[PDB]
């Protein structure tokens, strides 16, 4: 394949040399190349593709939406993964399956790029579904959960922190939980989330309420 | 409107404040008051119902 | 990378200087650059992109759909978050996950 490609390259070089030469050296053959714009189209499409990719790479370098080793994604098209290398033509992304993903540079031209690798906090969200018969303790449970969250060493007190009775559900009364953690590490965030969930379970059990299963009323006949 | 297993009543209003926490607190208070009213008037909230013909 | 980019920039500068110069200074080489419109396309696409983004930013400044620190969204495409900065080319939006979101200015043109 390499030798065939070299042969074709030198054939193209000979063709271009013949085209450059005028009547003094053989015949220019300009009309043949411009017989129907074949040479024009051949040059134009290749140049357009190469220049588009090259300029997209240059703009990527100048704007700096992401760097090597950054976790990125896009709501427009999926490119999720960790950046491995930014070439002049193709950007290599390592997916979370440990598989290469080759993205042409021009695909970044007009899309919104998210950079989770540059996040400042990790969010924790969950819903507590209590039974409809536990409506008398909703306020106390919410207050207890908020107090527990406000005293947790792993929670960031400068970020949003909401715990309120949110909405009626089909078979439960839902309570929203919304907070952030100081750390941005995967394992530490997961451990903090697990600890918070266990504490929430303990609080709910201690206050006399319980979690609601999908309920249903049956009329027998 | 009539539902599959309940009679639905719509609630539609606005709050003076535009703050997230204050709006959520007002919503929770309104929901608790609605629950109290419904319980006091003798009605109750409907679970997904179903009629079963045994054989 | 910075030094390589500088080298390529000065190479392009030398190329443009050679193109500007006529027969008095070497050869203009205009035909080579216009052999198949390579230079024309290279200038046109870059200029179109840069000008589109710049003019979108200018229109954003003049119309004032939003300001710094404003929660925004769009039913057409998702950009939800709080505006962090409005640059000449890219607008930075902080999502509710506390992650940066870089939106080219031209994406606000028709939505
Ligand atoms: C082994 C034969 C190789 C022949 C390659 C021909 C290449 C033609 C290029 C035409 C470009 C317009
Ligand atoms: C110097 C600025 C370069 C801008 C490059 C834009 C490339 C757009 C390609 C779009 C292909 C669909
Ligand atoms: C070839 C075009 C070069 C454009 C360079 C733009 C540099 C932007 C720097 C922004 C720093 C905040
Ligand atoms: C037709 C224009 C081709 C331009 C190719 C430029 C390649 C630059 C590579 C820089 C080394 C990574
Ligand atoms: C038609 C022009 C082709 C230019 C090829 C550039 C190759 C650059 C390789 C950079 C490796 C780091
Ligand atoms: C280290 C080698 C760098 C070579 C850079 C070549 C840049 C070519 C620009 C062509 C623009 C049409
Ligand atoms: C002074 C008015 C500037 C208007 C800029 C419009 C840019 C449109 C870009 C569309 C790209 C798809
Ligand atoms: C370059 C074009 C400038 C257009 C300026 C429009 C100003 C609109 C002001 C509207 C105020 C209500
Ligand atoms: C080819 C036209 C380029 C125009 C670039 C204008 C850049 C203005 C920046 C203003 C400072 C924030
Ligand atoms: C090709 C023209 C490039 C113009 C680059 C403008 C850079 C403006 C930076 C403004 C920072 C506040």
Numbering used by the authors:
A (entry chain G): 114 to 334
B (entry chain A): 280 to 334
C (entry chain A): 114 to 224
Task: Provide the publication's sentences verbatim.
To prevent cell lysis, bacteria have mechanosensitive channels that are gated in response to the elevated membrane tension and release solutes, restoring the turgor within the cells. One of the medium-sized paralogues is called YnaI, with 5 TM helices. The TM paddles are in contact with the surrounding membrane and are therefore responsible for sensing the membrane tension, while the vestibule with the pore formed by the TM3 helices conveys conductivity and selectivity.
Open WT-YnaI channels with an overall resolution of 2.3 Å, and the overall structure of open YnaIA155V were indistinguishable. The most prominent feature of open YnaI is the diminishing of the kink at Gly160, which separates the pore helices TM3a and 3b. In the open state, the pore is wider and shorter than in the closed state – the effective pore length is reduced from ~35 Å to ~20 Å. It intercalates between two adjacent pore helices and stabilises the larger pore diameter.
